[PDB]
Every structure is written in structure tokens, then in C-alpha cells.
């Protein structure tokens, strides 16, 4: 599986999870977050060769089709599959408050 | 939203749904479906410039690439919402009818 467990220890040029750290203040201008100053969003990038990543039913059928039919349709690319929320802390006044932003962390990739 | 209704109306080169009918026996070698003989499966394709901001992550990356001098990923036009298809087969001499999940693509996203 194309997760941190595999992709961050091993050197790979095929479609994998790629590290990326985003400083809230300097990299987005999201001055309204007090904590944390940034976070590891990551992304998905690299090649999709033969049998590298399975996706849905639909990806399997497209690839079979593309082999059996003379006029192939579309070829797969590297995208996210499993996202994960991120809890941040901001202040109104001296008052703390917690919001859970959904789908902020890429935890795994796929070919589609 | 890049669904069947928007994208078919105007054939665009930017990311979109695209029509693709598929015959089971003729194009995948699936001789066991009694019926239907094919179906419009569709696919997703087209240019994605600097983002379909459905999910907050793709927004974050779209913005990061603007403000950071060293941008990260580029987007790509990929499936989004998938709906099943209802088949029919008889490998067992009696009529079966399941729903085959994730067989049609009804929308697309840049991601």
C-alpha cells in the first residue's frame, strides 16, 4: 500500500506518497491559526506502470479495455485516496477554540 | 461540477467527463453477463490548470503552489463519483441480477 509506512523509507519514482510540510502563516497566509505553525500535508506523485496500483472496478475495466480495444481511452495518473482531518487551535480574544478541518492530510495514494 | 450534464453539452479540452461505451464480450472478454451487451462507462480527461477545490487538500495545494516559490504537485483529471450498474447472468441455469458497484463514472475532479 502507498502509505507513509512504505514510501518514506524507500526510494521510489513510481506513484507514491511524497512528503510535504506547509507552514500555515508563510505558505498559505492563514494567519488565523495559532497552533500548530504548520503541518505535513504531503502529496501524491510519480509514474503508473504495469500493475503498480489498483483502483476501483472502473480503473480495472479501463485498463483491460485499453489493452483489448484498438482505440485506447484514458491512462491513469497518481492521486490521493485516503485523506485524514487535521485539528487546529485558534483564539477569539484570549479564548482557545478547536476546529477539525476535514481532508487536510494525504495518508495514501493510488493510480486512477 | 463536471458531471454528465455540463461536460457533454460543451466539448471542452479542460478536465471533463467523456463518453465511452464498452461492450462486455467485445472489449473486455466478459462472456458471462447475459445482459446488457455494453454500457456507457465513461472516463475523465482533460487539462487541469492551477484546481477542482472539492476536498480541502486540493485547495491547500492550489494555494501553496501560488505562494511558495517551489510548487508541489500538479492536478490531474480523475474519476470522482462512481455509481453501480445492474447486470444479469445465468451461470447456474437460473436468472441472477446483482448490482455491479463502481462501474460508471458520473463526475470528474481535478486532483
Amino acid at each position: 500500500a502507498l502509505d507513509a509506512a512504505y514510501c518514506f523509507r524507500n526510494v521510489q519514482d513510481n506513484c507514491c506518497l511524497r512528503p510535504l510540510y506547509i507552514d500555515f502563516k508563510r505558505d498559505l497566509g492563514w494567519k488565523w491559526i495559532h497552533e500548530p505553525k504548520g503541518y505535513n500535508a504531503n502529496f501524491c506523485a510519480g509514474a503508473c506502470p504495469y500493475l503498480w496500483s489498483s483502483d476501483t472496478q472502473h480503473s480495472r475495466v479501463l485498463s483491460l479495455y485499453n489493452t483489448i480495444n484498438p482505440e485506447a481511452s484514458a491512462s491513469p495518473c497518481c492521486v490521493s485516496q485516503d485523506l485524514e482531518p487535521l485539528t487546529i487551535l485558534y483564539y477569539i480574544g484570549k479564548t482557545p477554540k478547536i476546529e477539525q478541518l476535514s481532508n487536510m492530510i494525504v495518508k495514501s495514494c493510488k493510480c486512477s | 461540477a463536471l458531471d454528465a450534464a455540463y461536460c457533454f453539452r460543451n466539448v471542452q479540452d479542460n478536465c471533463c467527463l467523456r463518453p465511452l461505451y464498452i461492450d462486455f464480450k467485445r472489449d473486455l472478454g466478459w462472456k458471462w453477463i447475459h445482459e446488457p451487451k455494453g454500457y456507457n462507462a465513461n472516463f475523465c480527461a482533460g487539462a487541469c490548470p492551477y484546481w477542482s477545490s472539492d476536498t480541502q487538500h486540493s485547495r491547500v495545494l492550489s494555494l501553496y503552489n501560488t505562494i511558495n516559490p517551489e510548487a508541489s504537485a500538479s492536478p490531474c483529471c480523475v474519476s470522482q463519483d462512481l455509481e453501480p450498474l445492474t447486470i444479469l447472468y445465468y451461470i447456474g441455469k437460473t436468472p441472477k441480477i446483482e448490482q455491479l458497484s463502481n462501474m460508471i463514472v458520473k463526475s470528474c475532479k481535478c486532483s
Epitope: R18, G38 | S74
Partner: antibody
């Protein structure tokens, strides 16, 4: 860590050329690669880059004349220019970013290592 | 965004100390994405100073970067005969165009 440019020579006014940087000691999925050119006796000029994550950005004056691309199996990055005017006679270098991408700390506008340069002559 | 270098040309003696100033039309990202490069004729640019002030290891200490935001200077302390070269500054930016940009160069010629 090396970057060897190639693809260069003389080309007809208005034609097209594609150059290729051959990268050796590093992986293109950690390092951005940039293309900067300099006319004979003129200053350097950043034409653009292809990032560790696969994003290409260009100088504002490129105007879609240049496209930067990469292949990690081929270990190369490409600068494809079309519609060569006289202006674009120059030496072209590919320069790596100094630091890996996506790290909490960036490269600080620093390029390292550099390629030797390959001359490109636009003339009839 | 463009950035202007001064002076375009200058001559000084062995031992003397020289100042080159880069100046950015627009603020550079994080205020320290500005580097300085040595270019001998018929060579690629050598990297002297990254982050406006950090010195590349093995590049000699007689080079120093100071400045921030939009104004930066490089200072060569005890000019050497082998320090004749043209000297460029690069800077990083935000936006969807011109992420990086060089200066006009400064040819430094030694007095004899």
C-alpha cells in the same frame, strides 16, 4: 550529483528545439530542476523549473514558448522551446535546487549543482 | 517582479573590500529567499551565499550576505586576484509566474 546538458546546436529561425538535462546523483522526485539561460555577454535569466512534485512554472515573458518536463526512469528533464526568434541565441544551463523539496525549510532561492551549459544558435 | 543590482561594473584592489547591492521591486518570500552567485567566464555560476546570509560550506568567509525584505548586499572582504568574476543575485517570489529571478550582474575587475 551531476547535470549534463545536451540537445544543443544551430537551429533555423522560427523552428523548434528540445534540450535535455541528464541528472545523475539525485532523484528527480526530491529535487526541482530549473532552466536558466544567458545570452552571449549578457546576464543570467530564469526561464523556469519543473518541481520535485511535478509542477512546471515559467517566467512571465516565456508566454507558452517554453515547456519544461521530466522523466525519472530516463533520469532527464527537458526544455522544449518552439518558434525560436533571434533573441533566444544563448547558453542554457539546468540548475538543481540546493535542497530537497517539501521540507519544513526551503532552498532559499539557491541553485546547486549547475550544468556546464550548452550553446544554442538561432540563425538562418 | 524584477530586481536591480548596483553597481553594474566596479574595480578594486587586492585586499580592498567591495559591496554589491541587490534590490527587489517586490518583497521576496519569507524575506530571506535571496542568493548570491559567482560566475567565472565560460563556467556555470558558483553558489556563494544562500538565505541572504548563510555561507555555502567550503566557500570562503571573505564573502558575506546581509539584508532582508527587499534590500540585500554582498560584501567581499579581502579581495583576491582569483575573485575577479561577475556576480549575480537570485531571489524567490510568490505568485504563479516568475518564481525566481536574477539580477543584472556586477563585473568585478581587480586593480593592478
Amino acid at each position: 550529483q551531476q547535470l549534463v546538458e545536451s540537445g544543443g546546436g544551430l537551429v533555423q529561425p522560427g523552428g523548434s528545439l528540445r534540450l535535455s538535462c541528464a541528472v545523475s546523483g539525485f532523484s528527480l522526485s526530491s529535487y526541482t530542476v530549473n532552466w536558466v539561460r544567458q545570452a552571449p555577454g549578457k546576464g543570467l535569466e530564469w526561464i523556469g523549473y519543473i518541481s520535485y512534485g511535478g509542477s512546471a512554472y515559467y517566467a512571465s515573458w516565456a508566454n507558452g514558448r517554453f515547456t519544461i518536463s521530466k522523466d525519472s526512469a530516463k533520469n532527464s528533464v527537458y526544455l522544449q522551446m518552439n518558434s525560436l526568434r533571434a533573441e533566444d541565441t544563448a547558453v542554457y544551463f539546468c540548475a538543481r535546487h540546493m535542497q530537497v523539496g517539501g521540507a519544513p525549510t526551503g532552498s532559499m532561492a539557491a541553485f546547486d549543482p549547475w550544468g556546464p551549459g550548452t550553446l544554442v544558435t538561432v540563425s538562418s | 517582479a524584477q530586481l536591480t543590482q548596483s553597481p553594474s561594473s566596479l574595480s578594486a584592489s587586492v585586499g580592498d573590500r567591495v559591496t554589491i547591492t541587490c534590490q527587489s521591486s517586490q518583497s521576496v518570500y519569507n524575506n530571506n529567499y535571496l542568493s548570491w552567485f559567482q560566475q567565472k567566464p565560460g563556467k556555470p555560476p558558483k553558489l556563494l551565499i544562500y538565505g541572504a546570509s548563510t555561507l555555502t560550506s567550503g566557500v570562503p568567509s571573505r564573502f558575506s550576505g546581509s539584508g532582508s525584505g527587499t534590500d540585500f548586499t554582498l560584501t567581499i572582504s579581502s579581495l583576491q586576484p582569483e575573485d575577479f568574476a561577475t556576480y549575480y543575485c537570485a531571489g524567490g517570489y510568490s505568485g504563479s509566474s516568475d518564481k525566481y529571478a536574477f539580477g543584472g550582474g556586477t563585473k568585478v575587475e581587480i586593480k593592478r
